[PDB]
Amino acid sequence: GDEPEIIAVRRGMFGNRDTGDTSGYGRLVRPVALPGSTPRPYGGYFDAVMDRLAEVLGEERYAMSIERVVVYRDQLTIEVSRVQLPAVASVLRDDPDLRFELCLGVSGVHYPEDTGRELHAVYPLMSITHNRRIQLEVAAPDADPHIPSLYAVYPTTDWHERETYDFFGIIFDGHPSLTRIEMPDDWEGHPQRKDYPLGGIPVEYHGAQIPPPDQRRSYS
Amino acid sequence: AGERIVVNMGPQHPSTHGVLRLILEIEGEIITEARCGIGYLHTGIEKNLEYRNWTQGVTFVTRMDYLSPFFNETAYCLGVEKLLGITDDIPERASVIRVMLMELNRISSHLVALATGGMELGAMSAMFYGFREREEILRVFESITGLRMNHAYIRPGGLAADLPDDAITQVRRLVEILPKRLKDLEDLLNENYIWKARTVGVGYLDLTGCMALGITGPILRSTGLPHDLRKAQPYCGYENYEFDVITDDRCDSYGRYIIRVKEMHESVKIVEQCLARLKPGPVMISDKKLAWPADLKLGPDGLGNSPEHIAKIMGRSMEGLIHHFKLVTEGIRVPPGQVYVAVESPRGELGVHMVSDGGTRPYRVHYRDPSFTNLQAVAATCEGGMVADAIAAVASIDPVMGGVDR
Amino acid sequence: FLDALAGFAVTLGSMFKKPITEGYPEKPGPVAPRYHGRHQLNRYPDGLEKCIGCELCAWACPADAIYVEGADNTADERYSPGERYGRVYQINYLRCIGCGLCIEACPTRALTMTTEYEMADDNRADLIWGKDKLLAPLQEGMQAPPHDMAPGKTDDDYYLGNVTP
Amino acid sequence: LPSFLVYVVSMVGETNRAPFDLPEAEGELVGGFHTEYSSLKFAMFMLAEYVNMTTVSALATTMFLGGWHAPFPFNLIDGANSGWWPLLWFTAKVWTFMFLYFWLRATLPRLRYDQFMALGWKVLIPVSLLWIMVVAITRSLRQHGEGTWAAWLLTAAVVVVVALIWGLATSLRRRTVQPPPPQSTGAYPVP
Amino acid sequence: GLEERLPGGILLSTVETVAGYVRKGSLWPATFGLACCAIEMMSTAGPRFDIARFGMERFSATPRQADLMIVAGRVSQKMAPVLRQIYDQMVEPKWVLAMGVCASSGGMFNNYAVVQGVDHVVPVDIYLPGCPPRPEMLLHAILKLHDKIQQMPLGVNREEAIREAEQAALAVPPTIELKGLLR
Amino acid sequence: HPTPLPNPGVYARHNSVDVPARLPDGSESPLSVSTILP
Amino acid sequence: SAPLRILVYSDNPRTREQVRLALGKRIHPELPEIEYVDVATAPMAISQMDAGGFDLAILDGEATPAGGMGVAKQVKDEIDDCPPILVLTGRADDAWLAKWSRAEAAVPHPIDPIRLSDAVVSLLR
Numbered sequence A: 001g002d003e004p005e006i007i008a009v010r011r012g013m014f015g016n017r018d019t020g021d022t023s024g025y026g027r028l029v030r031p032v033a034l035p036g037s038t039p040r041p042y043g044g045y046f047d048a049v050m051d052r053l054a055e056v057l058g059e060e061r062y063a064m065s066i067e068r069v070v071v072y073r074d075q076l077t078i079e080v081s082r083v084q085l086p087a088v089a090s091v092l093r094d095d096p097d098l099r100f101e102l103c104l105g106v107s108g109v110h111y112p113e114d115t116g117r118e119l120h121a122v123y124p125l126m127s128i129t130h131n132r133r134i135q136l137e138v139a140a141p142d143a144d145p146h147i148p149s150l151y152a153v154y155p156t157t158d159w160h161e162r163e164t165y166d167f168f169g170i171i172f173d174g175h176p177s178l179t180r181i182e183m184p185d186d187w188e189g190h191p192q193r194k195d196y197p198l199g200g201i202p203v204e205y206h207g208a209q210i211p212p213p214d215q216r217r218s219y220s
Numbered sequence B: 001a002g003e004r005i006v007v008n009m010g011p012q013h014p015s016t017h018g019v020l021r022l023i024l025e026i027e028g029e030i031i032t033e034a035r036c037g038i039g040y041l042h043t044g045i046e047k048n049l050e051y052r053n054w055t056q057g058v059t060f061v062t063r064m065d066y067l068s069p070f071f072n073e074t075a076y077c078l079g080v081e082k083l084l085g086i087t088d089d090i091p092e093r094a095s096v097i098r099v100m101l102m103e104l105n106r107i108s109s110h111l112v113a114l115a116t117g118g119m120e121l122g123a124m125s126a127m128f129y130g131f132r133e134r135e136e137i138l139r140v141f142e143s144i145t146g147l148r149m150n151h152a153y154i155r156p157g158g159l160a161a162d163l164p165d166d167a168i169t170q171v172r173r174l175v176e177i178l179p180k181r182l183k184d185l186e187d188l189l190n191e192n193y194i195w196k197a198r199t200v201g202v203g204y205l206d207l208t209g210c211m212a213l214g215i216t217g218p219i220l221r222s223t224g225l226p227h228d229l230r231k232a233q234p235y236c237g238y239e240n241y242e243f244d245v246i247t248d249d250r251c252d253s254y255g256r257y258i259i260r261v262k263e264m265h266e267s268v269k270i271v272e273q274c275l276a277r278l279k280p281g282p283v284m285i286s287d288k289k290l291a292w293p294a295d296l297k298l299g300p301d302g303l304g305n306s307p308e309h310i311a312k313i314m315g316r317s318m319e320g321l322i323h324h325f326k327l328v329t330e331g332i333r334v335p336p337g338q339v340y341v342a343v344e345s346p347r348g349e350l351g352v353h354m355v356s357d358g359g360t361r362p363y364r365v366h367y368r369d370p371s372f373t374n375l376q377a378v379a380a381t382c383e384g385g386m387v388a389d390a391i392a393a394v395a396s397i398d399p400v401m402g403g404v405d406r
Numbered sequence C: 001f002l003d004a005l006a007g008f009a010v011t012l013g014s015m016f017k018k019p020i021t022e023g024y025p026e027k028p029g030p031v032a033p034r035y036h037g038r039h040q041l042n043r044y045p046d047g048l049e050k051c052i053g054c055e056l057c058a059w060a061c062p063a064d065a066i067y068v069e070g071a072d073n074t075a076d077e078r079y080s081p082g083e084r085y086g087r088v089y090q091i092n093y094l095r096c097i098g099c100g101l102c103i104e105a106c107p108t109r110a111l112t113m114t115t116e117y118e119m120a121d122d123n124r125a126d127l128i129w130g131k132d133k134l135l136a137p138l139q140e141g142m143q144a145p146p147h148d149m150a151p152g153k154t155d156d157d158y159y160l161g162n163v164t165p
Numbered sequence D: 001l002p003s004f005l006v007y008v009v010s011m012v013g014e015t016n017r018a019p020f021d022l023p024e025a026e027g028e029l030v031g032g033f034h035t036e037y038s039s040l041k042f043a044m045f046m047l048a049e050y051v052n053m054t055t056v057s058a059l060a061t062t063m064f065l066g067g068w069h070a071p072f073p074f075n076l077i078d079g080a081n082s083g084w085w086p087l088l089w090f091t092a093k094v095w096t097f098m099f100l101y102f103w104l105r106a107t108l109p110r111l112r113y114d115q116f117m118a119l120g121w122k123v124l125i126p127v128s129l130l131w132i133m134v135v136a137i138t139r140s141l142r143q144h145g146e147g148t149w150a151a152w153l154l155t156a157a158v159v160v161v162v163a164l165i166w167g168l169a170t171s172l173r174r175r176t177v178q179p180p181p182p183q184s185t186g187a188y189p190v191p
Numbered sequence E: 001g002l003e004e005r006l007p008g009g010i011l012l013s014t015v016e017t018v019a020g021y022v023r024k025g026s027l028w029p030a031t032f033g034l035a036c037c038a039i040e041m042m043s044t045a046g047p048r049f050d051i052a053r054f055g056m057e058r059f060s061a062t063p064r065q066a067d068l069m070i071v072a073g074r075v076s077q078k079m080a081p082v083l084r085q086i087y088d089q090m091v092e093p094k095w096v097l098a099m100g101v102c103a104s105s106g107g108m109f110n111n112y113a114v115v116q117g118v119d120h121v122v123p124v125d126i127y128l129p130g131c132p133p134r135p136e137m138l139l140h141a142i143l144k145l146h147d148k149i150q151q152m153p154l155g156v157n158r159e160e161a162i163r164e165a166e167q168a169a170l171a172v173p174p175t176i177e178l179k180g181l182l183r
Numbered sequence F: 001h002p003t004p005l006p007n008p009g010v011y012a013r014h015n016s017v018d019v020p021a022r023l024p025d026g027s028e029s030p031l032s033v034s035t036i037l038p
Numbered sequence G: 001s002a003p004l005r006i007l008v009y010s011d012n013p014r015t016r017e018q019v020r021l022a023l024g025k026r027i028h029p030e031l032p033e034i035e036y037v038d039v040a041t042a043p044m045a046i047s048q049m050d051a052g053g054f055d056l057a058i059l060d061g062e063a064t065p066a067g068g069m070g071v072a073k074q075v076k077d078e079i080d081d082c083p084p085i086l087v088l089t090g091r092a093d094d095a096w097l098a099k100w101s102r103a104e105a106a107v108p109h110p111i112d113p114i115r116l117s118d119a120v121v122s123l124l125r
């Protein structure tokens, strides 16, 4: 790692997702990289949090567990390597200096262009005792969408691992019962995946109809 | 074992808000196991957001957790602004109005919670008095925004429009009357023997339970922990307001109800402070590259873009016309990145994970709605008690299912 | 000790206060001046339609509740100042969410939102309001929309507000 | 008066009316017993409820409010208690009781039926039984010329009961409890 | 019922008019509500307005006593079976008011999760725009439903009305063919 | 401790409490349906 | 043989025309002749179903005042020995509801003549 994480490659001026309306403007190639690894002097209490996490975790264990550290908009994200998630979560919750007792949930986000890391689970953690907060990010490939479930560490992640599963298919291995919570159990597909179509219908008008927004042209 | 029924509180039930499905194993009439069934109000708002621009998904987010529209809007707009790095550029008047509207909305949401809880617990007139107060609050909201619910008034970088000239007077009248009229509602419930017997000691949940389930809002603060995202992790300039975090130590339904009742008065105090600090000025960022170009004004033909703005864009300013056209059609472009922004909605920490891929549409917008997490406490606060106690416990959780399902 | 009975004193008291209900429909209550009522297509003082059919209102609609089709203002039949006018304009009020983004989108103020709200039908199609149902009534001094622009006036004059009946 | 109060509480209980309203309990059991009933079967259940309200209000009027006798402002009027006026007075008293029903419904939430049974057995029944004794002893003493003693006992008795019931309302229903112990969930630090 | 066996003379006409007057009044809504439209329905019941003036304050907790089903909010896929069950568990005559854009056509939520109008699963009698419709709009739609209920036929008149309505409906073109002035 | 147990599965044609929920592997989750139910 | 009677329900006359075009007088020469009863309103469709004598009902899930899926559920709950029901769905995601309606088959819009014919043959066979 240590390089910028490109989630999508945007080519052509004006955010055209296809050939483009005006000729000659489609040759730009701008990769869409999320913020990369932050230089070590993190801001505010992030430095203390990371130093404590690296002290509690062995240097080898820390290097194996923490895949990346990002400080964006004065918010700390820790790209935690899959598999090692339960260990670092336990350390964060239990370590007196960290004491991130309040896990606010799990959010799924799909990056279909992020090879080997399509599905990200975001764990916003807050320490009331220290009035701190951080986010963990766990990436998983579309091929093996498995993440260690934090049910033992953060029971609140229950239903969240379910919602995130229901909407993305992340399997959260070890969850007591990873059953669809929003969509019906007979439902096919995971709606919030980018490949899942919006599933709208045309809007009816006198003599015309407007297709759903996902079918019509857009610029990003 | 074979002597206990299993019943559906079901979506269609007066206390289940029409879409919540409590599945209760009752041994006689004691709840033995309490499964929670969700998704009957799933709406695809989170996915449908992805096909609309910024300043447009506002109209979507205001409709999840529809009892706290301004809170959803404020969380969304704070996320967008933080992604833009604009949070420090928002006009002071816009932030003050945001705080004022969030606190009035807190009063309104608590009023709905008290109304529906009293109705569920038989307090018939509680619903009517709570909605009588909420009617004045919604009159103010309608005058400010032109809508009674699902307002899209708070926009990325400020507000949709400035306050009408009469708005300040109406809000001052609210500050004057809300305590007196809330006195009527408190008299019906606060010290009522039946109300206390019906809620005191019911739906108990210790601080350990709140942490384990990640509960927040009045449920958590009924445990005595003064956790409030307004004091801890301040936003929208809440740090400039003198108010006390309401917290109780009963850890039960009545404690949560009292917390809401006192939060109404704290919100009244914060609104008085907002009026004191409200000063004339812009309500949208000065950066024309991001500022919402619309300038709504009233006339004999109704509400529409002000004739001065029409003159500027269609008559003299080519740059103005281009900016209006683009900011209205495609909208702003938000630099790529992730941001988790949290506010203290009436029901707890309303969090928003917002991911932008550099485009004109939100790449991903997830609401950690406090009701979704709080409903995980139904098993703790219902198992062991009677179904009558389960009703009170669920009402105390005050779940708005729009936020639950989204 | 009487505090526990305070609620009684409330209700009984209210039983002697005048009910606060608005008298709708006989005496409808006062809506906010800024309320987001039915969209309305407005005209210039001379009767020309303001809508140039730019589709910005439809563009900004989150619910795809507006359908607009522009057409040329040929000299034989002119409906709005300038080159374009919206000849087809439909609002699907079963998709409208009253957000008001459309009016904020309009560059001509051709679209406003009135305070009128009474609207409902037993038929889905009947709630797709066309241009005829949305156009503001032809006021005094106005003329039929298919007529030439005011003498010695141009589109810029209309937008600058320098036109009269 | 103690008999009147116990009877009134039992009236509201008998008619399945708020704040008892238990069998229906709309907010709890949807429709309660009359769920699965529609049309005139439900109509007849509600008719029976209202006729019971009227019957028991009229019984209260008969037993405690002097039945059809004219009230004091009209009692002095000649012929008020004779002719068809007694019908007017009886209807007025019955409708005051109906107003009490409606007022209770508007003001009070509904009890849990366990709480209602606790009210019946720990308060109503003991109070009524103590009152039955007190009244018997009082009347026996008065019949034997004891006089003052009765006037004392009665008052003392009520003075005790209103206190003892107050205890059940305030002392037995203690409003304090100890804090809970922490567990594996790593609780935060309380204020 | 025997009221549907009555001969089509003045007797049937008077039974129809009295039944319509009786049913337009006392039109108990079902205690049912999905989303913010439910909040506006409660506000309509609230003091500022008064649904009660129209004899409609008794929100029947059970569908058996309910006469009108104000959908009052968005209907998700998983909820449509429940809403249909509630509709079927009401006893005729029944009416469905699609309150709000979500209930009537899916509104802004044109996606997989929303049914795109409750008429997909239950016969809708009145569509009510708004998001949410303000309480006056709900009362307007309710009065429109009252007018519809008043003119509701019975018996042989009901059969003739059904046949005539069918004949009229078979001829109307679809909305997609009303190309008036479309280029 | 088993945070509120998974709700009974909701299927087209079946949403009663007796219906087990579907695990990702397609198997019925035992915890979804109360043990007493057949 | 007995002309198989098919009920075609749709507020849209063009959907009825397409359904009748996919299924001719005979779906196949081996099958009996087909007679079509067109119904535009749900009350008429329900009354026709109550009258009975139908071998198949094609119900448009997109019907305006009363959707085809709702009518399918109603008829399978209200008519004893009701004929097989075929539902036309306006979108792919409606499939779940099509399953809920207990319709024997579901054909998405736009109506593919061949897919509709094959489904009808399967239901009548």
Ligand SMILES: CC(C)=CCC/C(C)=C\CC/C(C)=C/CC/C(C)=C\CC/C(C)=C/CC/C(C)=C/CC/C(C)=C/CC/C(C)=C/CC/C(C)=C/CC1=C(C)C(=O)c2ccccc2C1=O
Binding pocket: B013, B014, B015, B016, B017, B018, B019, B112, B116, B124, B127, B400, B401, D040, D042, D043, D044, D046, D047, E031, E032, E033, E034, E035, E038, E039, E041, E042, E045, E057, E058, E059
């Ligand atoms: C046989 C014969 C004909 C004889 C001849 C004589 C003759 C004619 C008859 C004799 C007399 C008889 C028998 C007459 C018949 C009538 C009769 C017996 C009685 C019926 C009438 C009656 C009982 C009247 C009084 C009833 C009464 C007190 C009604 C008031 C009820 C109230 C207060 C209703 C308001 C409820 C309300 C606020 C409704 C909203 C419901 C909602 C919104 C549901 C959904 C929902 C909910 C539930 C939330 O709380 C919620 C909270 C937060 C977010 C979302 C939601 C949400 O989605």
Ligand code: SF4
Binding pocket: C050, C051, C052, C053, C054, C055, C056, C057, C058, C068, C086, C102, C105, C106, C107, C108, C109, C110, C111
């Ligand atoms: S109504 Fe306004 S925004 Fe819409 S096409 Fe006409 S001028 Fe353009």
Ligand code: SF4
Binding pocket: C039, C057, C060, C061, C062, C063, C064, C065, C066, C091, C095, C096, C097, C098, C099, C100, C101, C102, C103
């Ligand atoms: S109010 Fe909003 S949803 Fe309705 S037509 Fe205007 S822009 Fe579209």
Ligand code: SF4
Binding pocket: B063, B066, B150, C097, E034, E035, E036, E037, E072, E073, E074, E099, E100, E101, E102, E103, E107, E130, E131, E132, E133
């Ligand atoms: S129509 Fe609007 S107010 Fe009603 S449920 Fe849908 S989004 Fe909510």
